[PDB]
Write a protein that binds this ligand. Structure first.
Ligand code: CU
Ligand code: CU
Ligand code: ZN
Ligand code: ZN
Ligand code: ZN
Ligand code: ZN
Lengths: 153, 153
């Protein structure tokens, strides 16, 4: 089994810790933790290609997408590797994250260790928003917080 | 060729950006960039095992050392994978880093992507200090700044 972790920070109040665990190669990755400082409701949540935060979250590049597929929802066959389920913040601005995803991985071609996890300003429209931008980014707006995904004990 | 990058931060004083590049599998890695906010002179410079910054630099674990070797100098056959050359800060507290290291890698068993780079309070004694601690950590004192090593474009 493999574990990873990410500390999310930004220029506003959004901050969080997200854990990843994968019991076996190509198996589901469990994703969990808490993010605070968010507006109530849904927020886009993606793995971006680069673990480069030299210019903040902007330097993380696009969604992790090694086969140049369209942006989609987590359950779509046509999705980027980095297209995780939206997180949901409650009335106190807290998202308690509970995700299982079988497209991301902690080894192999879909490995996300060393890449950037980003939480967004708005909801990800899952590629279903009816404009081209939707099938590139999900229209999730700005990058509010992020961090590089690291190997954990 | 593969590139990686690391943003070093701690609690305010010490800040830096370090780049990594490796032309081929098993080949030397070039390490370069700049760190500011240091006292003049030598500072230990290590890759630690875990890319876990949940408790700041403390949660990075020990030096990256997959074969349970002794701590050494970078040119020693017996060293941890993470034992890089000390960095040297000038009289203004700036270390211009220029390293070539043949033991670290950006792929394979010695891969450091997803692990933590750490710069220290004191010089690493290269495992040639006067106590048993020397051959574990190099007696480099506190972890002044760190970051997770991420994949770069
Ligand atoms: Cu994103
Ligand atoms: Cu160290
Ligand atoms: Zn199985
Ligand atoms: Zn996407
Ligand atoms: Zn060669
Ligand atoms: Zn060492």
């Amino acid at each position: 089994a493999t574990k990873a972790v990410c500390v999310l920070k930004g220029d506003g109040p959004v901050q969080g810790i997200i854990n990843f665990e994968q019991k076996e190669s190509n198996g589901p990755v469990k994703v969990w933790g808490s993010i605070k400082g968010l507006t109530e409701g849904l927020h886009g949540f993606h793995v971006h290609e680069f673990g480069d935060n030299t210019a903040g979250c902007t330097s993380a590049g696009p969604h992790f997408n090694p086969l140049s597929r369209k942006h989609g929802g987590p359950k779509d066959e046509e999705r980027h590797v980095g297209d995780l389920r939206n997180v949901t913040a409650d009335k106190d601005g807290v998202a308690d994250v509970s995700i299982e995803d079988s497209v991301i991985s902690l080894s192999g071609d879909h490995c996300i260790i060393g890449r950037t996890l980003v939480v967004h300003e708005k909801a990800d429209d899952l590629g279903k928003g009816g404009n081209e931008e939707s099938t590139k980014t999900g229209n999730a707006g700005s990058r509010l917080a992020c961090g590089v995904i690291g190997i954990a004990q």
